[PDB]
């Protein structure tokens, strides 16, 4: 892959590479569609519009939007102007977005109407710098200083040229949560999604122009941002977007061509979603779908899930591992080389190192801390020098995963190095769940650990000590949590115990809980 | 009043004042009591303990504690060591405390056991610098590294001298919220509580050594901090503290001598609480109580509440207005000079100005913006230069209130200049409540305004536009907000309307809602 030139604007790059296919559908969703030419026009008009409201090069805007045709316009339009979009999870709380507004110093927000209430709450509680709110598909009357996204785009002529950005200039942020502390602002350059889209989207997945890409992982996920934006635009594929929650029924409807007159040829999702789909009694037969490639990320793919999918569809699930920090997969199975129970082989262009506690090599078959050297690494966590130095050093990026290298060069996930859980491809801190449970007045202590279901898919499991003189229901706690945290941050099962296992120091013996002693 | 010396440590000042009365009870609560000697001992041992864990002079510690004998130990012990306690409301959310931890850079937390769960959540989610959590009266097992307050204090010899602070050095912070944005860190000096305790506590209220002080307003409120700590310690009075919520029954029990063998002689609280007590069927008779002085603040005292109290008890309610920024009252009725319907006269030592639209004087009988010039003003809002400039300008502190000066020199409250409400005498932002309501899926729009109830007390009133195509009941809306807002923020009434009055920009015409137009 040829490196991007020193002067490089990733949005310009994606627009330019599709000037040969102006009338092909770039993006289609439930209610709208954009050809590549329409996408380019709206992108450059939004770029002009953002500059007109005074957002300057390198300033941030918050992109808080459901998947839909407006999303790539917002993302690329900002980048084309040299403005840094901060693309965020749409399922978070007002508290979460309040922090993101403050930390990013976002000068404007591009928000879906359905998310306007939580954004409004975040704006009211925060010390933000937001000058304008741009509402895509408003679901309530606009407030002062808010503008409809279509009107905002429609009111400005296209910017003539992209900002004169450098390949190594920041292009966009994603936020990544760790086990404690605030979410980290992961800074990606213009070059980074070029490298992922070439090394992985084109050269590993072999995406091509006639594909129809459809990702259950939303665009704000590093995974989905490649799957359903940077990858397909790099090759001219058509992308199906879906705003609603990706349930088996919702995915099946898209697979069967229920939207846009298109049948996806390439699907991406999390192992949990594949398992839920394989269990569904209305699972389509392979004769009904156009799938040629099934991609997985976000959590390890149990061999039994992939084997069952392959038996039913005659397609493998191609499991790869990426991270927010590396932007896309650095270890992956190949479309025609799948070893279930492993994450496959280094993606060409990425170097992988496993390190033991001494920082030295580890023997094959022994677990080591996974480090990645690749051209798509984020530059830093914005405003967190300490965590940046711990994660990014000397061209190597520390994943916080443990991995085993097998005899055939494949890599098998061996767990985390920080108790983070990955439920449905989204990071979940067990400590955040625990601290919310203990706020319930009937809870004395609580411990949340990751426990595999029969499938080998890790889910949060709560061990709760009730307070004497109170009785607790499991649903009572789930509700209590949903009233405070994002809606997916709840234990999948809860066991009430008289006492938690602890060391002499009072430290909870989480391994005993995981291992099932109680 | 003689100014404090330039070398001045307020905690040492209060300890020194009471060395003449070592065996008198300083503080007593449901389960404990501290003589002035015991208080000084425990204060100086806590000061040494904080220094021993590395907290340095001028660093902050978060003081998140229910009222109880440990509270003045934590507060004065920090101050004695030259460490800045940040005394905060105990009814806030984990997100509020997470912000306060980061914003204050608190190096330790002193927390009541009952509040450890919300603190734990705040620690887990924030980028804090807390080195140690000290738990007063733990309600659940200590976590590794945490220490019990009693052990923490008991494990360290008393510091031999206080930090050699100056009178105008920061001594402590309180947090105060405005209609939007984060709570503001109000910075008070060592001199400020000297000025309030001398000018108001001693010279206006005439508190004296044989008083027993009891404040419904908690110690973290500027009002309560004077009422139940700086004022009584200044004169050697005994103070009754109560951890639980101040219901009429809870207050009556202590008025009647149910705790510590003492009957309060001085009571302080909000007009809302006085109204609640006057409505209580077991309102004590004046022969049953030892009250000689009843103070109110927080919201305007409706004349009928004062008059009914005076008719029942033969005792007036002495209404004074203070603020977090001014620390205590700057306009007040006097123990023997009460004009109901007014906040009385300037507190000697404080200069009052009413300013019009251009900053000039306003003619008597006309409302103006209230500005205060007095020696207890906070110096700034920490880390917010913009809001500091708008509030503190050249010796004058802008209250955010409007007032009318009467012919007899008294001052009659004329509302706020900023949409904030004082419900139950506590700051409530209508915008917070609105932003909570619109996150309910059946709510399209919401407007919250203050309306005076049957007793003349302002309560929030919600006007809600339901979302078309959704079912929404007043009961389900009450359930929705019950576990999302503190009770004092609950709208006392919700009206479902078809539309809200707006300007063309979408601004809600809240004045029309206050005028009953809907
Ligand atoms: N395939 C696979 N196996 C095992 N663990 C995996 C995995 N994919 C992802 N993880 C875990 O998730 C962490 C990275 O999370 P992000 O939420 O930081 O990155 C996303 O998962 C992405 C997945 N694909 C992309 Cl392309 S980006 C990782 O460290 C693993 O712990
Ligand atoms: N007595 C009285 N009448 C009318 N309004 C009053 C009032 N006291 C207080 N207010 C309002 O409350 C604002 C200040 O609120 P605060 O939480 O910063 O401080 C407290 O209310 C204090 C009250 N007494 C103390 Cl001593 S500290 C004020 O601006 C008024 O709007």
Automatic annotation (TrEMBL), chains A, B:
Cited InterPro entries: AMP-bd_C, AMP-bd_C_sf, AMP-dep_synth/lig_dom, Benz_CoA_lig
Binding-site positions, AMP: 298, 319-320, 324, 401, 416, 422
Tree of life domain: Bacteria
Domain AMP-dependent synthetase/ligase: 17-382
Key word Nucleotide-binding present: yes
GO terms, molecular function: acid-thiol ligase activity; ATP binding; CoA-ligase activity
Keywords of this entry: Ligase, Nucleotide-binding
Residue span, AMP-binding enzyme C-terminal domain: 432-507
GO biological process, one term: secondary metabolite biosynthetic process
Any Pfam family matching the protein: AMP-binding_C
Protein name: Benzoate-coenzyme A ligase
Organism: Rhodopseudomonas palustris
